[PDB]
Amino acid sequence: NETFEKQLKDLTSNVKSIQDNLLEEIITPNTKTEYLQRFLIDRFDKELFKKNVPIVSYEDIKPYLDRVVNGESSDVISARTITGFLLSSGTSGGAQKMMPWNNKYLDNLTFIYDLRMQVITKHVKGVEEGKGMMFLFTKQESMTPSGLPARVATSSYFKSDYFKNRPSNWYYSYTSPDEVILCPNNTESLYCHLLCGLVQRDEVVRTGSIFASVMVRAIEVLKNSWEELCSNIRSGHLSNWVTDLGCQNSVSLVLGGPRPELADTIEEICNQNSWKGIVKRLWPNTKYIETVVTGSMGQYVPMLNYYCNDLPLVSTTYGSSETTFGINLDPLCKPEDVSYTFMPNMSYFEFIPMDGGDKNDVVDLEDVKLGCTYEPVVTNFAGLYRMRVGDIVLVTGFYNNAPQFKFVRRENVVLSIDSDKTNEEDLFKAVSQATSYADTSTFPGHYVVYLELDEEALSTCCLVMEESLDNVYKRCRFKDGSIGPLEIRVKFFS
Ligand SMILES: Nc1ncnc2c1ncn2[C@@H]1O[C@H](COP(=O)(O)O)[C@@H](O)[C@H]1O
Ligand SMILES: O=C(O)c1ccccc1O
Numbered sequence: 001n002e003t004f005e006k007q008l009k010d011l012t013s014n015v016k017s018i019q020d021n022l023l024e025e026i027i028t029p030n031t032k033t034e035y036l037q038r039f040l041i042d043r044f045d046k047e048l049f050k051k052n053v054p055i056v057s058y059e060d061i062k063p064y065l066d067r068v069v070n071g072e073s074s075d076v077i078s079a080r081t082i083t084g085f086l087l088s089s090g091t092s093g094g095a096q097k098m099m100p101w102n103n104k105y106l107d108n109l110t111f112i113y114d115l116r117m118q119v120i121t122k123h124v125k126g127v128e129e130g131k132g133m134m135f136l137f138t139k140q141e142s143m144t145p146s147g148l149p150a151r152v153a154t155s156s157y158f159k160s161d162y163f164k165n166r167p168s169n170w171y172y173s174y175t176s177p178d179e180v181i182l183c184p185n186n187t188e189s190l191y192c193h194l195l196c197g198l199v200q201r202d203e204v205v206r207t208g209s210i211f212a213s214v215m216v217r218a219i220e221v222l223k224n225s226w227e228e229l230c231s232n233i234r235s236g237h238l239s240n241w242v243t244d245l246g247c248q249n250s251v252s253l254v255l256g257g258p259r260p261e262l263a264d265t266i267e268e269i270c271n272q273n274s275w276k277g278i279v280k281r282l283w284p285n286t287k288y289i290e291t292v293v294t295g296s297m298g299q300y301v302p303m304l305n306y307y308c309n310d311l312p313l314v315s316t317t318y319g320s321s322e323t324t325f326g327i328n329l330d331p332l333c334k335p336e337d338v339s340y341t342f343m344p345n346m347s348y349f350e351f352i353p354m355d356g357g358d359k360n361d362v363v364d365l366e367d368v369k370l371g372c373t374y375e376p377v378v379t380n381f382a383g384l385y386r387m388r389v390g391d392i393v394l395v396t397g398f399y400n401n402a403p404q405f406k407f408v409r410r411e412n413v414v415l416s417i418d419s420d421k422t423n424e425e426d427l428f429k430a431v432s433q434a435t436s437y438a439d440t441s442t443f444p445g446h447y448v449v450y451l452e453l454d455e456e457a458l459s460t461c462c463l464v465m466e467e468s469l470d471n472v473y474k475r476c477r478f479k480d481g482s483i484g485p486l487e488i489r490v491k492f493f494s
Helices: 002-013 015-030 034-038 046-052 058-069 103-123 155-156 178-182 185-201 214-233 245-255 259-271 278-282 295-308 424-435 457-468 470-482
Strands: 084-092 095-101 132-133 148-151 204-211 288-292 317-319 324-327 340-342 349-351 372-381 389-399 402-410 413-415 434-440 446-450 487-489
Touching: 002 015, 002 402, 015 034, 015 046, 015 349, 046 084, 046 424, 058 084, 058 095, 084 155, 084 317, 084 470, 095 470, 103 155, 132 185, 148 155, 178 185, 178 245, 185 214, 185 245, 185 259, 185 470, 204 214, 214 278, 214 288, 214 295, 259 278, 278 295, 288 295, 295 324, 295 402, 402 457, 413 424, 413 434, 424 446, 424 457, 457 470, 457 487
Parallel strands: 084 148, 132 204, 204 288, 446 487
Antiparallel strands: 084 095, 317 324, 324 340, 340 402, 349 372, 372 389, 389 402, 434 446
């Protein structure tokens, strides 16, 4: 508390000096990299940096990134060794962007985890002796020619000691064994998350996932699997179809032995007329749902409130493959009122105005204007200098001297159900090969493109349209099952 109260007041009061000091911390060891040498940055000088280092897009610097991805020394862009890459949900030329990465990403990520934990406990009581049923997933890595792995942000965390050796307190205590969280087969691991959460239902004081789409999926899978889950509880055995050795061993220990009475109890709850409030009925000690409900995830809020009996939905964190940005300092607000306060120790932040309210070319964090929209620009600890993020944010206020931002949209994105972010360009290519709407009225959600009939021909249209989308889409569609068959309404399905 005392340490935290002071910590937060300082971070948010001293933004100007923290940002300027951070930029010096980044630039000084990097003055001899090929990249900074190119732009004649031979010492820390903020004015020369702003004047001479260009504001770049991913495509602008891809030739440097490709070199590091292929095995060239990371000193071309960063004197802090690059030890891996992050796979962005954002795409470049149909291929997922690969951002450079090192353990500073995890230093900052864990800093934010500890900070948001304190923010939550300040405002929410009755959580410190319980566990969380957190639907957390690991995604198998992709190998690059350099031999370094490329992972999604949270997988870079789970597959590290930052997670394995995390703090032993309520916030880091889950109903699922680590083996379940680490399991790269997410169909198996989601089933196991639910089973373990049910067995330990009285201990659950929070539940959630990174994004709302995954929370909704977990509930939908519960609705479709409860009979089987209860049979495992009754018998004290995990279903044979789960092949992961880690899950088998760890979940067997959670089960312990036959629990016919607990099975009866759960079955009676699931057999009611309606699924309304099911989360709070199965997990009666839950204090809040922890999941992002901003941006494209806002579409899931009505379903969440239905299943959770208006438990608070707490949307804590805004982050990307470039850097974690910051957190929600008013966690108990309504989803539509969520703003994120950037933390000035994360990266050096600049902002390009996206409307007429601010006529500058680019501005520092401390200079953004209320009610104006911007694209964030990031200088980080892994070789990105003044990189455009492609998101649009709106200044809603200032907490002490720290600007607070509403997430508006990812620029150019037209369709999003889960982690997929299909942009106008991808959709143009698809309809060529052949308007739209993201339908989440049913699960899973699915794309809907408005365009007797040759049903073979129009079913092939749906097909070639999907085949032209990106790898994130195809993973959600064919592997996760988080996205259903694309639908063309002239109705035909892929
Ligand atoms: N709290 C949030 N609310 C809305 N969108 C978010 C949030 N956090 C991340 N995102 C979006 O998800 C994108 C994915 O980042 P990346 O890890 O590069 O795929 C971000 O750039 C944002 O567009
Ligand atoms: O790690 C998280 O909890 C997180 C949440 C939202 C966006 C990016 C993130 O890494």
